[PDB]
Amino acid sequence: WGAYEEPLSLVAGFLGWFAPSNIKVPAFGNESLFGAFHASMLENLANFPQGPALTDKFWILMITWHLGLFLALTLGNIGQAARKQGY
Amino acid sequence: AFTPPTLQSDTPSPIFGGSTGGLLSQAQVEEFHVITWESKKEQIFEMPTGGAAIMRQGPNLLKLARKEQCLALLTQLRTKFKIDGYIYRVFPNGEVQYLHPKDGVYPEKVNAGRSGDNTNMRRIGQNKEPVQIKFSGKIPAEF
Amino acid sequence: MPIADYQVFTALFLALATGIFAVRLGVALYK
Amino acid sequence: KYGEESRYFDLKDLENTVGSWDMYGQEDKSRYNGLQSEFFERAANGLSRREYILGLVAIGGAGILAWGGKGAADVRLPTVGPQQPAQVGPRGRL
Amino acid sequence: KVQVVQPVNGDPFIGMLETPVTSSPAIAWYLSNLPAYRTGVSPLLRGVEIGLAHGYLLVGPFIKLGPLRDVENVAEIVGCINGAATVLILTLCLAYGAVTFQGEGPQVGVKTLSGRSIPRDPLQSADGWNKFTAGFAVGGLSGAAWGYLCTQILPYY
Amino acid sequence: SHTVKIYDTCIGCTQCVRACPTDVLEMVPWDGCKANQIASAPRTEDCVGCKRCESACPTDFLSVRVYLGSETTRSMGLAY
Amino acid sequence: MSAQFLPSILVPLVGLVFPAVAMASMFLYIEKEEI
Amino acid sequence: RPTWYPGATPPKYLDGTMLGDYGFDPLRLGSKDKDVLKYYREGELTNGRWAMAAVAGILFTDLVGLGPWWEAGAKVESSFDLKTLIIIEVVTFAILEGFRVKAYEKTGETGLGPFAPFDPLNMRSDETRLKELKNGRLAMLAFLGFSSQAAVQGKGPIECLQAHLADPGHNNIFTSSVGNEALAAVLVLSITPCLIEAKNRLQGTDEEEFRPLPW
Ligand code: CLA
Ligand code: CLA
Known part of the structure; x- marks a missing residue:
């Protein structure tokens, strides 16, 4: 990032930009968790x-x-920085 | 025919990742100790400050705080790897003073030429009575 | 007849003098 | 220390072999505004002496005595306030 | 393959380690920009800033928790309480300076993490601490005074 | 700085020297025992007072005695 | 009691001013290097 | 050199270079740093000057028959509200004290405004300075006596003197509400020099390790 040494890569935005795509799915009751x-x-x-x-x-x-x-x-950051879980 | 070996500053240190039990601020204003030894192979050893280090193949130098830490490491090297080392005392001004193998011969071995300091020629019960040395900043063992 | 304020003030002043004598004795003892 | 390799001891540079580092210190004389700095150094002019700075602390000691003899009564402290009736005691006492 | 934990300044025989909490770029910058770590700034100004911040943050506790917190005159009483606390920590600073700085000795030099020689902080001197203590008094008392004004002003509060 | 003393009852077994953790004692030539050696304390400034030397002495009573005295930065075993 | 104001001044003096002064003086004296 | 009692031995640091040196300082307040002693002298001179002005004003108002000086604060009628007067006095005194601070920081003495020595008549000398110091000390005790007489007695500087002249044996401090306390002070002070002499005889004058009020 611009500051710090945070391993949170910019390409890793899929975490927060993909979690809603799955949490918005209806769960029968009510209408949806995110909704x-x-x-x-x-x-x-x-x-x-x-x-x-x-x-x-x-x-x-x-x-x-x-x-x-x-x-x-967190799990996605670990997986992405681990490179196909090379550890 | 023995002379204190000079301390070489070009001696590499053992492979260690670092720890919080190392030197503090006392070594900057008071003193610290240095132990240098020679190893025939690169091997893992236990440090007195916690953790495990790897001594290189050849000369190794390690700086510790107290002299007891250096002596403990030397005891470990002598009883585990059969390695002999030298301990020096370094002051902030830059003075190095040889220590432990004072005359090149270990203290447990008589060398014939040392100082027989603090050796009373009487028994433990042959000391002066405490009432006979009253009002004198000395104990019965110093008479 | 309760003690008046002037009596308390006089006692405090005498105590101050006594304290001065005490500090002098302490200084002499330190030497 | 000449730590160019694995040597962390150097008599010619013993200062670096004992961990004598500032770590976070940084010398920089360009920061506080000159007009504001002058005001503060001027306000704390003679207050830099031990005897004078202790005098400021002595004022706090006077305030402590002032509170007991006036401040405590002005805040209506219970100890400086009045008292209501009393009790008799276990037996016929007071 | 990255190792975020390294020995302090590469030396593995010093009682300290470099972690993302101590050697973090942003953390290091913020910690280095504090008035306490300014070797080139006058100790009086740094002391004034420290005293101002401390005096301002010290009113709140007595305001909302003092014995007279349920009275309209709590702000004034607390302003005085903070002034007293500032004066107390003031005499503490003076005692520390008089005890710590009373002698001289050829101390070892000071260098940066890179190895650049730097002079010792002027704050660590008899006159340096006195100037810092004086600034702390002016700033500390001003901070407590400003704490009372903020209570009267500040439309939200 | 403790006071370490050696008495003529010593048999020169060298156990106290080997038990010292700060190298304070050493063996020097002597002629009062069969071992022809006596113990000595030339570096009492480095003595910490652990009394390990006394726990190793086999003579009765002990031939080596440690009297704890003024404490220093070395006798207190302080690394800070 | 006569002079009710005296305790309100003596109690803080003996419990706040005197102890602080005594502790400061003792602390400054037990670390003088040359007494 | 005259002292604060016959045959008094002045302290070692009170050799006599300073003016008005009577060897009086039982608490040893200015025996450590010389700069602090100079500041103490400046404060003494300032207090003395203010005391002389106050005593002169109080005496003048009493001689012209005006009301009590302590009560004169509420008997003043004129323009300018109390707050306005307070603000004007605070501002003018702030600038005057700033000028005085600069004067002391430069010439080491007092002054009036930008004038560092302020002596239009050129009446400055070591002999004239001693007069100012002694007069200031006398005025300070005079003002202290004025306040004490106003508190114990219900009279002023002139009324108290008249009352004493009417009956000196029955109109004194030892016959007032504070006589008992006064009787305890004199009796102690009367034996203070002699006791000190004993210390100078049995113990001697070889200084002491500590000071009463270190500061
Ligand atoms: C830890 C236990 C504890 C706590 C929480 C309290 C709390 C309190 N006591 Mg109390 N007290 C205690 C123990 C405690 N007491 C004990 C053991 C005794 C007997 C010896 C007393 C005797 C006592 C008395 C006599 C009185 C109190 C009073 C009070 C109240 C006001 C005191 C005050 O404002 O002080 C000042 C508070 C501060 C100066 C703030 C310091 C703490 C700050 C918030 C630390 C914050 C650190 C911060 C998070 C750091 C982070 C880093 C940063 C970068 C963010 C208050 C709520 C007074 C009261 O009237 O009660 C209502 C009172 O009169 N206490
Ligand atoms: C050793 C005897 C002794 C003891 C234990 C006490 C105890 C006490 N006195 Mg008291 N006092 C004493 C002697 C003593 N007094 C004498 C002889 C006098 C006559 C002058 C007084 C006159 C006096 C007054 C006027 C008041 C008290 C008050 C008090 C109470 C609060 C303390 C205070 O702040 O006042 C301060 C006390 C003094 C200024 C004078 C005391 C001086 C004594 C003799 C010092 C003795 C030191 C001791 C021998 C050495 C021990 C070492 C130690 C200091 C570490 C407290 C319970 C106050 C009170 O009534 O509380 C409600 C109060 O206002 N005392």
Whole structure:
């Protein structure tokens, strides 16, 4: 990157630009994980004014979506920098 | 006919990846020690500061903090690889002082020509009574 | 008849003098 | 240290063989604005002496005594406030 | 195949290691640009900056947690408390300077990671610490004073 | 800086010298024992006080004694 | 008690001013190099 | 050289080079650094000058029959609100003190504005300086006495003197509300020099390891 020595390569954007392509798939119930997360984000306040109360649907949706996104980001970075898992 | 061998600064150091148990700030303002030995092959040894290093084939130099660390490494080399080493004391100003093999002969072996320092010619119970040396900054063993 | 403020002030001043004597004795003992 | 190879000891460069490095220090005299720097060095003019800087600390000691004799009463501290009734005790005491 | 952990300045016999936390470019730049690591800047100015930051960040705790936090006059009481804390750490700095710098000795030189010789920080001297301590007092007291003003101003707060 | 002393009861077994972790003792010629050697402490400045030499002495009582005294940067075993 | 203001001044002096002064002086004296 | 009591032995550092040197400094406040001693003298002179001006004003207002000086703060009627007066005084005194600071940093003495020595009549000399120091010290004690008399007694500098002249044996400090405390001070001070002499006799004058107030 421009600063640091972060191994997060620019070509590795597929992590965060591909995880939504799979998290947007409907899961029968409700409409979709990302869809529900975005709807909650845009409805239960713009995650800045008041608050998501105590233990709301938005909390679990945000935690699950971020869990998947972070795991995909880190695992993909490891795999891409490992070059076909050469370690 | 023995003279203290001079310390060569061109001696390479053993292959080590680094550790947090090495020299600190005391070596910059007080002193540190250097142990130099000769190995017939490149082999893995245990360092007194933690971890494992690889001594090269030929001359090896290692800088440690205390003299006890150097002596422990020398003991390991003598009892494991049958390698003899030399220990020196280096000061920040740049003075090197020979140590351990003082007269080229190990202390456990009599050399006939050393100083018989601190050797009382009496028994342990033949020392002066503490009441007989009162008001004197000395213990009964120094009489 | 409770002790008045002037009595407390006098006692404090006498204590100050006593403390001065004490510090002098301590200095003499240090030597 | 002459660490061009595997030598980390050098009597002619003993300064580098003991790890005497600044690590993060950097000398640079171009940073603070001249007008603001002058104001601060001027404000802390004579306050650079041990006796004078201790005098500033002595002011804090006076403030401590001032609080007890005035500040504590102005903040309505419970110890400096009044007291309401009392109790008798276990038996016929006070 | 890359090894992000290396010995300090290539020397593997020094009690330190270079990790992406200590030798990181951004981390190194930010840490080197602090007023404490300015060998060429006057100790008084660096002390003023350090005191300003410390004094400003030291009001908050007493404001929201002091014994009189539930009273409208909490801001003033806390401003005074921070001033007292700054004066205390001020005498601490003076005592440290008077004890640490009281003698002279031919110390070893100082070089950079590359091997470029640099003079010792002027802050590590009898007069250097005194100037730094004086700046810390002015900055520390000013920071506490500014902490009270921010409470009165700052439309959001 | 501890005080290390050697007494004539020594038999010159050289065990104390081998047990010293800082090289403080050494064997010098003598004529009071069958081994014709006595122990000595020429480098007491490097003595740490571990008393390992006493744990190795076989004479009764001990022929080598260590009296702990003024502590220094070397006697305290400090590497910092 | 007579002079109720005295404790409010003596308690902080003996518990805050005197201890700080004594500790600072003791710290400066036990590390003088040449007393 | 006269001292602060007959036969007093001045400290070693109080040889007598400075003016008004009576060998008085039991706490040894200026026995370490000479620069600190110079600053102490400058502060003493400043306090003395302010004391002389204050004493002169207080006495003048009392002789013309004006009200009490301590109560005169609330008996002043004129324009300019209190806050305005405070601001004007703070600004003018800030500039005056800055000029005085520069004067002390240059010539080592006081001054008035840009004038470093400020002596239009050229009446500067070592003999005239001693007069200023002694007069300032006397004025400082005079102001201290004014405040003390206003607190203990309910009179002013002239009224207190008149009351004492009316009955010197019954109108003194030892007969006021602070007489007891005063009786404890004199009795101690009366034996202070003699006790010091004992120290100079049994112990001698070979200096001491420490100083009362180090600072
Ligand atoms: C760790 C335990 C602990 C904690 C959290 C507290 C907390 C508190 N005490 Mg308390 N106290 C304790 C132990 C503790 N006490 C003990 C053991 C005693 C008995 C000896 C007391 C006796 C006591 C008294 C008598 C009083 C208190 C009071 C208080 C309150 C105000 C004190 C204050 O503002 O200080 C100042 C706080 C600071 C100066 C902030 C320092 C901490 C900062 C936030 C550290 C931040 C580090 C930061 C994260 C670094 C990161 C790096 C950076 C780059 C980001 C406060 C909530 C007062 C009160 O009235 O209670 C309401 C009070 O009167 N305490
Ligand atoms: C050893 C005897 C002794 C002890 C244990 C105490 C204890 C106490 N006194 Mg007290 N006092 C004493 C003697 C003593 N006093 C004497 C003889 C006098 C007459 C002058 C006084 C006059 C006095 C007043 C006017 C007040 C106290 C107060 C107090 C309380 C708070 C302390 C304080 O800040 O006041 C300060 C105390 C003094 C200024 C004078 C004490 C001087 C003593 C004699 C020093 C003794 C030192 C000791 C022998 C050496 C031990 C070594 C040690 C210092 C490390 C405290 C419980 C305050 C109070 O009532 O709290 C509510 C208060 O206002 N005392």
